[PDB]
Amino acid sequence: AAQTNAPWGLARISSTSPGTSTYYYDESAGQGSCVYVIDTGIEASHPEFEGRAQMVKTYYYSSRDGNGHGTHCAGTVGSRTYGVAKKTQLFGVKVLDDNGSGQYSTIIAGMDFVASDKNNRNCPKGVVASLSLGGGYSSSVNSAAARLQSSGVMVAVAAGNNNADARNYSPASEPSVCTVGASDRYDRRSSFSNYGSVLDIFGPGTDILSTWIGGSTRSISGTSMATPHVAGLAAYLMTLGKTTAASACRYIADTANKGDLSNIPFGTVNLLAYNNYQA
C-alpha cells in the first residue's frame, strides 16, 4: 500500500533515503495487534482513530486527555493518516496528568497494569507498549519496564530530551526494553535527543505531525514522537509474523538503515528504524 503526501516520518520509515513523502507498507497494517499508549490519555473520539482507540485505565479524575501529548503519540502509532500501524487496536493508560506529569509510583502501577490487562484483550498478533515518558534514574522504574517486557509485551521507551547520556534516565536506561532516540528529516540526530550505549534505535522525532485534542492536528518534536514510530513498527512487523514481542527490538535493529544519521556520538548506535517493505 502507498499513502501519498504522508508525514515525513512515515515516509522515512519505509525508505532507504531521506527526502521522500510517500509511506509504503503492507496492507495488513498491524491488524490483530494491540498497542498500549501509557501517557496523558487518548482522545478516542478523534475521527483519525476510527473506533480503534479506547481508554482502559486512568489514575486521575478523568480518563480524557486534557493535554494532547498522549493523543499525539497514539496518532503516530495507529491513526489512519498519521500512524505507522493503521489497523492496530490502541489502548490508553493515563499515568500522566493533564500537565504531562506523573509520579513514578503511578507510572510503575500503569506498567504492571498493562502486563496483566493484555490478558483481557484480543491481540492474537502480539502486544506492544509505548512509553513516551521518563525522569531521573530509578531502579524501580527500570524493573517495572523489565517486568512488562518479560510478560510478553514489546516495550518501547523514549530516550529523553536532555542531549545527554540516557544511562541517567528511566525507563530509558533499562537494558531489556527498546530505547528510542530521535532524528530529523535530514537524517541528523535531533538537537535534544539523548544518546549513549543504552539506545537501541532512532526514529523520526523532529517536526512530527499527528493527532491532537479537540479533533485537531499539530506538529511537535521529541523523543516522545520517535518512540511511537518504533512501537507502531513493532506492531506492524508482529502482525506480519516477522518477529515477536521478545525479539522485535533486536529485529528492528537488525533490519534498520545503518550508518545514515549525522551527529551520532561515538559509542551510540547509528541505526534508523526501517520497515523493509518491498512493494
Short mmCIF file of C-alpha atoms in Angstrom, two decimals:
data_model
loop_
_atom_site.label_atom_id
_atom_site.label_comp_id
_atom_site.label_asym_id
_atom_site.label_seq_id
_atom_site.Cartn_x
_atom_site.Cartn_y
_atom_site.Cartn_z
CA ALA A 1 0.00 0.00 0.00
CA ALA A 2 1.05 3.61 -0.65
CA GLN A 3 -0.03 6.71 1.28
CA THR A 4 0.84 9.82 -0.71
CA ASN A 5 1.76 13.11 0.96
CA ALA A 6 2.42 11.32 4.23
CA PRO A 7 4.15 12.92 7.22
CA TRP A 8 7.89 12.82 6.62
CA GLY A 9 8.48 10.33 9.44
CA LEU A 10 6.16 7.72 7.97
CA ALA A 11 7.82 8.11 4.58
CA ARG A 12 11.21 7.85 6.28
CA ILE A 13 10.47 4.54 7.99
CA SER A 14 9.65 2.89 4.65
CA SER A 15 12.59 4.40 2.73
CA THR A 16 16.29 3.78 2.21
CA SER A 17 16.69 7.56 1.64
CA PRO A 18 15.53 10.80 3.24
CA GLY A 19 13.57 13.33 1.25
CA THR A 20 10.54 11.38 0.05
CA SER A 21 6.90 11.83 1.03
CA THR A 22 5.06 8.55 0.31
CA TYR A 23 4.65 5.88 3.03
CA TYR A 24 4.74 2.27 1.77
CA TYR A 25 3.52 -0.59 3.94
CA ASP A 26 1.85 -3.99 3.83
CA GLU A 27 -1.93 -3.63 3.91
CA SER A 28 -2.20 -5.91 6.96
CA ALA A 29 -1.27 -2.68 8.78
CA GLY A 30 -0.96 -4.17 12.28
CA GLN A 31 -4.42 -5.75 12.26
CA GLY A 32 -4.76 -8.19 15.16
CA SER A 33 -2.06 -6.48 17.25
CA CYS A 34 -2.55 -4.14 20.20
CA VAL A 35 -0.55 -1.10 21.34
CA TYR A 36 -0.87 0.40 24.80
CA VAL A 37 -0.07 4.11 24.96
CA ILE A 38 0.96 4.86 28.55
CA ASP A 39 0.70 8.63 28.71
CA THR A 40 -1.75 11.52 29.30
CA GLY A 41 -4.64 9.57 27.73
CA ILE A 42 -6.08 9.34 24.21
CA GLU A 43 -8.95 11.33 22.68
CA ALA A 44 -10.53 8.15 21.37
CA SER A 45 -13.39 10.04 19.67
CA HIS A 46 -10.95 11.63 17.20
CA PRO A 47 -12.08 10.63 13.67
CA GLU A 48 -8.47 9.65 12.94
CA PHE A 49 -8.79 6.63 15.28
CA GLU A 50 -11.85 5.16 13.52
CA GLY A 51 -13.17 3.47 16.66
CA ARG A 52 -9.92 1.52 17.16
CA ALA A 53 -8.84 3.50 20.25
CA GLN A 54 -10.19 3.24 23.78
CA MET A 55 -9.20 4.28 27.27
CA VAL A 56 -8.75 1.29 29.58
CA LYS A 57 -7.28 2.84 32.75
CA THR A 58 -6.72 6.15 34.50
CA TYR A 59 -5.25 7.11 37.88
CA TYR A 60 -6.91 10.57 37.85
CA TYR A 61 -10.41 12.10 37.93
CA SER A 62 -10.85 11.53 34.20
CA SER A 63 -9.52 9.21 31.54
CA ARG A 64 -9.72 12.02 28.99
CA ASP A 65 -6.56 13.52 27.51
CA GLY A 66 -6.64 17.14 28.67
CA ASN A 67 -3.08 17.71 27.41
CA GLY A 68 -2.70 16.38 23.85
CA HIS A 69 0.63 14.58 24.26
CA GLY A 70 -0.88 11.09 24.59
CA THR A 71 -3.25 11.70 21.68
CA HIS A 72 -0.32 12.80 19.50
CA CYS A 73 1.72 9.71 20.38
CA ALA A 74 -1.27 7.40 19.82
CA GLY A 75 -1.80 9.05 16.44
CA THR A 76 1.76 8.21 15.39
CA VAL A 77 1.25 4.58 16.46
CA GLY A 78 -2.04 3.99 14.74
CA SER A 79 -4.12 6.84 13.32
CA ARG A 80 -5.42 6.46 9.77
CA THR A 81 -3.39 9.39 8.38
CA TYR A 82 -0.57 9.90 10.87
CA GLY A 83 0.05 6.33 12.04
CA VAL A 84 2.55 3.59 11.30
CA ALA A 85 0.18 0.66 12.05
CA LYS A 86 -3.11 1.92 10.66
CA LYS A 87 -5.23 -1.09 11.73
CA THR A 88 -3.86 -1.80 15.23
CA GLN A 89 -6.01 -1.59 18.36
CA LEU A 90 -4.98 1.28 20.66
CA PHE A 91 -5.41 1.13 24.45
CA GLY A 92 -4.85 4.23 26.58
CA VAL A 93 -3.46 4.12 30.12
CA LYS A 94 -3.45 7.57 31.74
CA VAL A 95 -0.47 7.68 34.11
CA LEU A 96 0.28 11.37 33.40
CA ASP A 97 -1.94 14.25 34.47
CA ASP A 98 -3.15 16.97 32.13
CA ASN A 99 0.04 18.95 32.77
CA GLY A 100 2.02 15.96 31.48
CA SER A 101 3.41 14.98 34.91
CA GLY A 102 3.17 11.77 36.90
CA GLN A 103 4.63 10.18 40.00
CA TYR A 104 6.89 7.19 39.47
CA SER A 105 4.62 5.09 41.72
CA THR A 106 1.70 5.74 39.34
CA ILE A 107 3.84 5.04 36.26
CA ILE A 108 5.00 1.73 37.77
CA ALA A 109 1.41 0.76 38.57
CA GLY A 110 0.47 1.54 34.97
CA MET A 111 3.17 -0.75 33.60
CA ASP A 112 2.12 -3.62 35.85
CA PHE A 113 -1.47 -2.89 34.80
CA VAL A 114 -0.60 -3.46 31.13
CA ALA A 115 1.27 -6.69 31.88
CA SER A 116 -1.96 -8.09 33.35
CA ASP A 117 -4.57 -6.27 31.26
CA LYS A 118 -3.32 -7.72 27.98
CA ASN A 119 -4.87 -10.99 29.19
CA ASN A 120 -8.26 -9.23 28.98
CA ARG A 121 -7.77 -8.17 25.35
CA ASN A 122 -7.72 -9.90 21.96
CA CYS A 123 -4.26 -9.41 20.47
CA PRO A 124 -3.50 -12.59 18.51
CA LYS A 125 -0.62 -10.95 16.64
CA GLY A 126 1.01 -9.57 19.81
CA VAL A 127 1.17 -6.69 22.25
CA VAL A 128 3.29 -3.51 22.33
CA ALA A 129 3.58 -0.71 24.90
CA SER A 130 4.73 2.81 24.02
CA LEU A 131 6.18 4.90 26.89
CA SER A 132 6.89 8.49 25.82
CA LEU A 133 7.85 9.50 29.35
CA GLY A 134 10.67 9.41 31.84
CA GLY A 135 12.69 11.12 34.53
CA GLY A 136 15.87 10.56 36.51
CA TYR A 137 17.34 7.11 37.12
CA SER A 138 15.18 4.78 39.22
CA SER A 139 15.87 1.08 39.62
CA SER A 140 12.20 0.51 40.48
CA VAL A 141 11.01 2.20 37.27
CA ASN A 142 13.50 0.18 35.22
CA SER A 143 12.40 -3.03 36.95
CA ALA A 144 8.76 -2.30 36.12
CA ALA A 145 9.65 -1.81 32.45
CA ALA A 146 11.64 -5.06 32.55
CA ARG A 147 8.66 -6.92 34.04
CA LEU A 148 6.34 -5.57 31.36
CA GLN A 149 8.75 -6.73 28.65
CA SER A 150 9.25 -10.12 30.33
CA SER A 151 5.47 -10.63 30.43
CA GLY A 152 5.36 -10.71 26.61
CA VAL A 153 4.97 -7.04 25.63
CA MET A 154 7.29 -5.23 23.23
CA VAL A 155 8.24 -2.19 25.34
CA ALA A 156 9.42 0.94 23.51
CA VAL A 157 10.59 3.88 25.65
CA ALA A 158 11.76 7.41 24.91
CA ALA A 159 15.48 8.10 25.34
CA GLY A 160 14.76 11.57 26.73
CA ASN A 161 15.24 15.15 25.55
CA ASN A 162 18.29 16.31 27.53
CA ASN A 163 21.01 16.00 24.85
CA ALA A 164 22.71 13.76 27.41
CA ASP A 165 23.60 10.14 28.05
CA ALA A 166 20.36 8.19 28.59
CA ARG A 167 22.06 5.98 31.21
CA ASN A 168 20.92 8.56 33.78
CA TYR A 169 17.20 8.40 32.91
CA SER A 170 14.41 5.88 33.46
CA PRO A 171 12.93 3.83 31.93
CA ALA A 172 15.36 4.81 29.11
CA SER A 173 18.29 3.14 30.89
CA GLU A 174 16.63 -0.28 31.30
CA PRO A 175 18.67 -2.67 29.09
CA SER A 176 15.88 -5.13 28.31
CA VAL A 177 13.45 -2.64 26.68
CA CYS A 178 13.76 -0.77 23.38
CA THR A 179 15.16 2.74 23.98
CA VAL A 180 14.42 5.17 21.15
CA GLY A 181 16.37 8.28 20.14
CA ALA A 182 15.11 10.97 17.75
CA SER A 183 16.19 12.10 14.26
CA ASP A 184 15.12 14.87 11.88
CA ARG A 185 14.04 14.93 8.24
CA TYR A 186 17.65 15.43 7.06
CA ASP A 187 18.88 12.33 8.93
CA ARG A 188 20.53 14.37 11.69
CA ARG A 189 20.30 13.41 15.35
CA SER A 190 17.61 15.67 16.80
CA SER A 191 19.19 18.52 18.72
CA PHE A 192 17.56 17.48 22.01
CA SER A 193 17.87 13.70 21.66
CA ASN A 194 19.61 11.77 24.38
CA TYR A 195 22.31 9.32 23.26
CA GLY A 196 24.55 6.61 24.70
CA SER A 197 25.10 2.87 24.67
CA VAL A 198 21.63 2.16 26.12
CA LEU A 199 19.91 3.39 22.94
CA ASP A 200 18.73 0.63 20.63
CA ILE A 201 17.34 2.59 17.68
CA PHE A 202 16.44 6.02 16.31
CA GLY A 203 13.11 7.09 14.89
CA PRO A 204 11.67 10.31 13.43
CA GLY A 205 11.26 12.85 16.21
CA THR A 206 11.64 16.44 14.91
CA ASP A 207 8.56 18.19 13.48
CA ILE A 208 6.16 15.23 13.61
CA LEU A 209 2.56 15.86 12.52
CA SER A 210 -0.08 13.83 14.35
CA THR A 211 -3.46 14.00 16.07
CA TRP A 212 -4.24 16.45 18.88
CA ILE A 213 -7.13 17.02 21.27
CA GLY A 214 -10.23 18.84 20.13
CA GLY A 215 -10.28 16.74 16.98
CA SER A 216 -7.25 18.63 15.65
CA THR A 217 -3.67 18.02 14.47
CA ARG A 218 -0.29 19.61 15.13
CA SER A 219 3.42 19.12 14.62
CA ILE A 220 5.67 18.78 17.70
CA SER A 221 9.13 17.38 18.47
CA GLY A 222 10.67 15.00 20.96
CA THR A 223 11.90 11.53 21.68
CA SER A 224 8.24 11.16 22.71
CA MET A 225 7.44 11.35 18.97
CA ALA A 226 10.15 8.90 17.89
CA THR A 227 9.04 6.21 20.37
CA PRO A 228 5.55 5.61 18.85
CA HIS A 229 7.11 5.25 15.38
CA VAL A 230 9.05 2.27 16.78
CA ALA A 231 6.06 0.95 18.76
CA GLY A 232 3.85 1.07 15.66
CA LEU A 233 6.60 -0.52 13.58
CA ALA A 234 6.86 -3.40 16.07
CA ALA A 235 3.09 -3.97 15.94
CA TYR A 236 3.21 -3.93 12.12
CA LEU A 237 6.09 -6.43 11.98
CA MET A 238 4.46 -8.71 14.57
CA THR A 239 1.24 -8.79 12.51
CA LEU A 240 3.38 -9.81 9.52
CA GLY A 241 4.79 -12.67 11.62
CA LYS A 242 8.36 -11.47 11.12
CA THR A 243 9.17 -11.11 14.82
CA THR A 244 7.75 -11.43 18.35
CA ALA A 245 7.42 -9.15 21.37
CA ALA A 246 10.58 -10.62 22.92
CA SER A 247 12.66 -10.26 19.74
CA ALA A 248 11.21 -7.19 17.97
CA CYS A 249 13.68 -4.58 19.26
CA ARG A 250 16.59 -6.74 18.09
CA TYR A 251 14.85 -7.40 14.77
CA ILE A 252 14.27 -3.68 14.22
CA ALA A 253 17.96 -3.06 14.94
CA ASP A 254 18.95 -5.96 12.62
CA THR A 255 16.89 -4.54 9.74
CA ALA A 256 17.48 -0.81 10.35
CA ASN A 257 19.08 1.65 7.97
CA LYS A 258 22.68 1.68 9.21
CA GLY A 259 25.22 4.47 9.30
CA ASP A 260 22.96 7.09 7.72
CA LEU A 261 22.50 9.53 10.62
CA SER A 262 24.76 12.50 11.34
CA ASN A 263 25.92 13.80 14.74
CA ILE A 264 25.72 10.36 16.37
CA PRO A 265 28.24 10.37 19.24
CA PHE A 266 30.95 7.73 19.20
CA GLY A 267 29.54 4.71 21.04
CA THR A 268 25.86 5.29 20.19
CA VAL A 269 24.21 3.09 17.57
CA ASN A 270 23.74 4.63 14.12
CA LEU A 271 20.51 2.78 13.32
CA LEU A 272 17.27 4.24 11.93
CA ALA A 273 14.01 2.28 12.10
CA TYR A 274 13.00 0.83 8.73
CA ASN A 275 10.12 -1.45 7.72
CA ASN A 276 11.96 -3.11 4.78
CA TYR A 277 8.69 -3.20 2.86
CA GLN A 278 9.15 -4.10 -0.79
CA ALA A 279 6.05 -3.03 -2.73
#
